[PDB]
Symmetry: C10
Subunit: 75 residues, 10 copies
């Protein structure tokens, strides 16, 4: 069992790597929101909900990584 526990711990750590994707992706979405509103202020009310949807969908990939991490850590 020392070997299995050790594996859960290294695996939990590895499972967080993919969070770099959400980190960068979330930022890409908000960068486009900022550049889109700067170029066309009147479009704000239209593109802001799209940025929220995009954030949420990118963020969810990170959710899936963290879920696995916690399953290894505790489950």
């Amino acid at each position: 069992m020392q070997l299995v526990l050790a594996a859960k711990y290294i695996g939990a750590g590895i499972s967080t790597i993919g969070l770099l994707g959400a980190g960068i992706g979330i930022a890409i979405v908000f960068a486009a929101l900022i550049n889109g509103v700067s170029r066309n202020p009147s479009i704000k009310d239209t593109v802001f909900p799209m940025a929220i949807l995009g954030f949420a969908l990118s963020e969810a990939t990170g959710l899936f990584c963290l879920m696995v991490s916690f399953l290894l850590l505790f489950g």
Copy 2:
């Protein structure tokens, strides 16, 4: 049976790394949606369904990673 279990757990953590791809990719699609709508608001109803398609296709690559991850963790 120790060694095999330990391998399943390390392998499961490694399987989540690919999700970073869907995390960046989902964001790339929504950035384009936002930038395209900002430049040409009239195109919104044409490009929004394209963004949905692109996001789902990108997301599915991530699904494949998480599928292998779950096959390892439980299967």
Copy 3:
């Protein structure tokens, strides 16, 4: 036989890393489609089958990863 079986399962996990390329590449294609249509709506019918071809070819690289992953798993 445990060590070999263990190696199969580590290998199957590693074999999915490459799917990040399709995740990004599929998105790159659709981004080009959206921006190309927004700039020139009249071109939509010409570039749409191009985006479908480009995404399917990109996705295929990731499927070859998954194939090796399943060869290792099963």
Copy 4:
């Protein structure tokens, strides 16, 4: 128990890798804010709250990594 201890230290180091996404992502947000303001100074007040939200959400991904890190260390 020395093996499990060793594993926690290795895992804690690995758990910091994902913070590179936050370091890059925060910068992407601030780059857009700077370029957006330079192109249209008058939009500053409108886009600044968006940059705060975007950087906060991007940085959160790095906090989750560090949270796993500190769970393993302590």
Copy 5:
């Protein structure tokens, strides 16, 4: 020989990683095709064969990875 067979299976999984390069590259080429055609529809017949060549050459890098991978698996 549990060591040798284990090495073949882990080696085979590692060998698929580079396929991410084709996944991204193929997409980069098709994105430029799409953006090129949107900007200048009349150039379609000229740039399309160029995109086919580019995709082919980028895809081949992936083929080589898969070849080393299959060598190790069999």
Copy 6:
């Protein structure tokens, strides 16, 4: 305890990897400052503090990596 000490030293090296994110991020912010000022010199006093904030926030992600690294080394 040769295993535990070995794990601390390998863990510490792995913990510096994420500093690449700050290295790239800091540069992204200063590049936008430079491009922003070149395009609109009059905005310099407005965007400069924004670049300082952005650099600070991106650099902090690196600080955290170095902190885990130093924890493991000592």
Copy 7:
């Protein structure tokens, strides 16, 4: 000798990773050729030889990787 054999198989898989640079690099070259031609069809004959040179030099990096790979396998 089984350990050294195992190592050659692992090393051969690792040696294919660098081919992702070729897959991306070839695509970058063809993207520029497509966009360059779309913007200025009349330059085609001048830039095409440049794209051949650039892709050949980029692909060479992947051949060196594969060369190391095949040295380890055979």
Copy 8:
């Protein structure tokens, strides 16, 4: 003591990976300087000290990697 010493040397190698961030980030800063000057020559004296600040701050992240590498080596 061999296993610990071995871990120090593996760790020292791993500790250099992060220097790729400064390699890229320094280049990002100079790229912005060149393009900003080419577009607006008159701004050179304003943006040059910005590029020096930005590069030195980016480089520093890599130096912290090297520091950990030398702590491990010596």
Copy 9:
């Protein structure tokens, strides 16, 4: 000595990773050559030697990786 030889072989394989940098960098330089000449044909004779210098300098990073690889393989 089995352990040292095995290490030379895995190390030689690892030492090729950095060649992805030359692969991408060379391509970046030639992409700029192509885009620069397309936008301004008259600058060709001026930017072409710069592209060669840039190719050579990027390429040399790859040289250094391969040199280490061959030192491990044979030296």
Copy 10:
């Protein structure tokens, strides 16, 4: 003495990975030089010395990797 030597050799291969950074970075600088000269040929004598500086600074990060690599291989 086996184990330590083996570690020096694996560590030396790992130390070259960072060179990918200088490989891309050198290329980024020369791409900007080419694009800037193409847009404004008159600026060549001003931006060429900047490219040299940027390339040398980027290259030096790679030098640091190769330095650790050589310290491991021989030192």
